[PDB]
Design a protein around this nucleic acid. Structure first.
Ligand code: K
Ligand code: MG
Ligand code: MG
Ligand code: MG
Ligand code: MG
Ligand code: MG
Ligand code: MG
Ligand code: MG
Ligand code: MG
Ligand code: MG
Lengths: 160, 157, 276
RNA sequence: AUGAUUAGAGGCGACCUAUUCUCAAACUUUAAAUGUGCAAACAAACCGGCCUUAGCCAAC
RNA sequence: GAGUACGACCACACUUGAGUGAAAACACCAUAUCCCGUCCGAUUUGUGAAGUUAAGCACUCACAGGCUCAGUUAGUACUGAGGUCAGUGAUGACUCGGGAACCCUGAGUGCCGUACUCC
RNA sequence: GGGCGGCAUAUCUGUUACACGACAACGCAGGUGUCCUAAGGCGAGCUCAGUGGGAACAGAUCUCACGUAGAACACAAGCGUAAAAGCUUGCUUGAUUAACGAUUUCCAGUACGAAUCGAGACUGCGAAAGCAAGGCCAGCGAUCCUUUGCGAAGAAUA
């Protein structure tokens, strides 16, 4: 059935900087330049901003994550996957991603998290007649790993 | 020590188990007019126009109707006499009373019987008392007695 | 560590059926059906608007204890009988549905020919006349769970009914073409939306290319006659409001008996006992 | 459910899973007996015309 | 025999696993110039009709968990009225009346309105 | 006994209290003379405490799933509340005036304090039905005396 094809729902880029000031502003500018859209600052929980994050979906997200896979050499550990059906990885020295380093902003790291899913997930997020999705229609860890292997390179196995 | 307005109402102004919630639509659509009999039962989920704890569970007569309120007359004994108290409550704390359901049915039955007699119809047969005598033909007969096993089965140890 | 023990279900209280299904806002419903007690249950009506994926439904409803009573209903899937046979969901379709419902209701009540409403749609706000010269028929708007934003098809149906002749209290703060920073309403934009000028512009832009408007392009619909079609539809609806489209094998599965279920369980337990 | 409280067993020292022994004026799903409010046709209630209202309802 | 909109009562209607679904609906679905709103057309708003029953939805099943109505527990626990009743007492039975609860065990798994539509 | 101690001297919640209401002790466990232009009013949008699987520094933040309230509502306690009464946000001043309307609690059916149902004016929020004359329920004061505000300017052969 064509409706069960797995697709990438969204990709979240997060930079937790700590403190607040020039470093946070520079990181926000760098993330905005990288993602081509305005990021959002997130505060602690006790009211000072501590991180900057952004969410990307669609053709831009599909075009992205290629630099992340290239940096990670298209290899990931098994435990990086989650029972929900999503995964992610870290990255350091975004100059490796190739953002044309400038002296104004130093080197920054980031965390990418990719969330996948099938069509029909709207029924759990719409306002009217909100319901729950079927367990069979859910996405399994084995299915996610098989999709990653079929679309990209392989993955190593570990314990922790 | 303390004699506040809502003192000692921990169990009185509380919801029954698994029956919480605000009043339904049937309460909102009920019609109340002057001269009706109502029961004053507080709804603890409204907290507006609540009657005093004394009047919870009393039955009275409506004497005034406002856009959101009802005026009820309640008898209250004080020393050697009975007073007619007039209280003002919101419409969500009253309900129509069935205290005259039996009497109203009695009047309707009398009218129906009167009409049938004038029309010369057939009246229903009259019930007979069960307290009269008669022959009894037994189907099953048993002996009633105290047996030894009755005493042995009374020592749970 | 398991939250769904037996005590959870023992102490669980379920919500109302329509709250669980997610289709009724009961606070709003209580406030909408509430009426002054001194009126002693005089009739009160709500115009309920519901927009589905491929149709829009408008109804005139009075509440009752046994259940709501529907006075008159109009559906968008009857517009082809009155003309326009494409879209059936846009703002012009909403306006036509509202006008048709108002005309049907007035004809049914017999007060027609005394409240002719507005002949030509100018998209201008006129205050409704209410008790709060014989008064018009009144009903209050019910949008359910839909989000109320400027330029919405629920308000399009509202405008259709008002121009038809019913008295629905409202303000022009949500019509298409209201400038919040200026607190003014532009009638030109409202008329353009009512007659579907935006749809015509989009159709022209799409046709000037090299899925959208697939059936539109399959038919010979030219993006220069939509306004005339809608005007003709308004005229036909006004002329003959009571018109519609031209005009038990069982499938239920029988439930097993309790005796049959017990027999099946006994047979299964005998089978496993024998296999052991 | 809240708050106390003894022991063994299974999964796996810890924990979860069902149990197990004993309890609460300021704990309770359930729930008496004795109570307590109202009504049981004569200034009332019931059944079909008429008059008035600056009350309700789009109108009657 | 079914569907949609508005509903009354608010678990016999809930929760977990499976299976089935004629027609028309409902829904997933496509898209972002305009109305509108977001970090993100995700939610929401506008405009459509290339695909699907995969999911939602409806029905059926389970020596399922809950829930509802009965039986048993039991004339037991408790209790109104009485004695120049028994007993050192604690307390108990008796006489004229009222009368429970848990565990355990049976049966069941929504029903009733208005309007429009499909067999 | 009195003294010393302490307020049981005005007053609020749970229990004592005996399934309507009422009920004492220098009985038990605790509170009150404050605080708030928002912590008041309204509309909209969200769902809390916690748990599990994941993501460089990171043994703070991001994401998914479960989650009947196990959180929160200034303060003591009880009750109540889930597309809210909780959290965020936008606009506001119903915390104004209110013709000597009626009523509840204490009770002598007196007052004070607190509270409930209303009619009129001018408003706020909302598309609308509607909601609101403070923060539900403790947080307060007679005679005499002192002190402040309204009897604006204009017009009547009265
Ligand atoms: K007391
Ligand atoms: Mg609303
Ligand atoms: Mg069962
Ligand atoms: Mg008492
Ligand atoms: Mg709200
Ligand atoms: Mg007075
Ligand atoms: Mg006073
Ligand atoms: Mg007023
Ligand atoms: Mg003074
Ligand atoms: Mg003057």
């Amino acid at each position: 059935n064509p409706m069960r094809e797995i697709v990438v729902k969204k990709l979240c880029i997060n930079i937790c900087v700590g403190e607040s000031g020039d470093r946070l502003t520079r990181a926000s500018k760098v993330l905005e330049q990288l993602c081509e859209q305005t990021p959002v600052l997130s505060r602690a929980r006790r009211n000072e901003k501590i991180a900057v994050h952004c969410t990307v979906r669609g053709k831009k997200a599909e075009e992205l994550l290629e630099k992340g896979l290239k940096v990670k050499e298209f290899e990931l550990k098994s435990y990086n996957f989650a029972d929900t059906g999503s995964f992610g990885f870290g990255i350091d020295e975004h100059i490796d991603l190739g953002i044309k380093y400038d002296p104004s902003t130093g080197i920054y790291g980031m965390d990418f998290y990719v969330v996948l899913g099938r069509r029909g997930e709207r029924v759990a997020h719409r306002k009217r007649k909100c319901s729950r999705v079927g367990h069979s229609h859910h996405v399994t860890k084995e299915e996610a790993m098989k999709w990653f292997e079929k679309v990209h390179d392989g993955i190593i196995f570990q314990a922790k | 020590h303390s004699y506040g307005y809502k003192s000692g109402t921990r169990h009185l102004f509380a919801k029954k188990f698994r029956k919480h919630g605000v009043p339904s639509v049937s309460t909102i659509l009920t019609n109340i007019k002057v001269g009706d009999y109502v029961d004053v039962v507080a709804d603890s989920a409204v907290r507006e126009g609540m009657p005093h704890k004394y009047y919870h569970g009393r039955t009275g007569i409506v004497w005034n109707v406002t856009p959101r309120g009802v005026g009820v007359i309640i008898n209250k004994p004080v020393r050697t006499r009975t007073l007619r108290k007039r209280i003002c409550v919101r419409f969500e704390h009253v309900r129509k009373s069935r205290c005259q359901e039996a009497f109203k049915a009695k009047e309707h039955q009398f009218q129906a019987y009167l009409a049938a007699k004038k029309a010369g119809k057939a009246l229903p047969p009259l019930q007979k008392s069960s307290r009269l005598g008669g022959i009894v033909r037994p189907k099953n007969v048993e002996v009633l007695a105290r047996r030894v096993a009755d005493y042995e089965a009374m020592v749970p140890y | 560590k398991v939250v769904k023990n037996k005590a959870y279900f023992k102490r669980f209280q379920v919500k109302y059926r329509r709250r669980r299904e997610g289709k009724t806002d009961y606070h709003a419903r209580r406030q909408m059906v509430l009426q002054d007690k001194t009126k002693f249950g005089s009739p009160k009506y709500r115009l309920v608007v519901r927009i589905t994926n491929k149709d829009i439904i408008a109804q005139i409803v009075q509440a009752k204890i046994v259940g709501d009573e529907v006075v008159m209903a109009a559906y968008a899937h009857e517009l082809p009988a009155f003309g326009i046979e494409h879209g059936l969901t846009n703002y012009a379709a909403a306006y036509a549905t509202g006008l048709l419902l108002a005309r049907r209701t007035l004809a049914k009540l017999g007060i027609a020919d005394k409240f002719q409403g507005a002949k030509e749609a100018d998209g201008s706000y006129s205050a409704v006349r209410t008790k709060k010269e014989r008064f018009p028929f009144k009903a209050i708007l019910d949008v359910g769970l839909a989000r109320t934003t400027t330029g919405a098809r629920v308000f399009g149906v509202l405008k259709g009914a008002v121009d038809g002749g019913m008295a629905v209290p409202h303000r022009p703060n949500r019509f298409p073409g209201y400038n919040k920073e200026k607190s003014s309403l532009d009638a030109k934009v409202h008329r353009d939306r009512i007659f579907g000028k935006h749809v015509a512009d989009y159709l022209k832009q799409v046709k000037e290319e090299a899925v959208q408007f697939s059936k539109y392009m399959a038919a010979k619909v030219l993006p220069e006659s939509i306004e005339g079609m809608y005007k003709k539809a308004h005229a036909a609806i006004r002329a003959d409001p009571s018109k519609s489209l031209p005009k038990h094998k069982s499938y239920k599965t029988k439930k097993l008996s309790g005796a049959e279920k017990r027999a099946a369980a006994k047979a299964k337990v005998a089978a496993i006992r024998e296999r052991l």
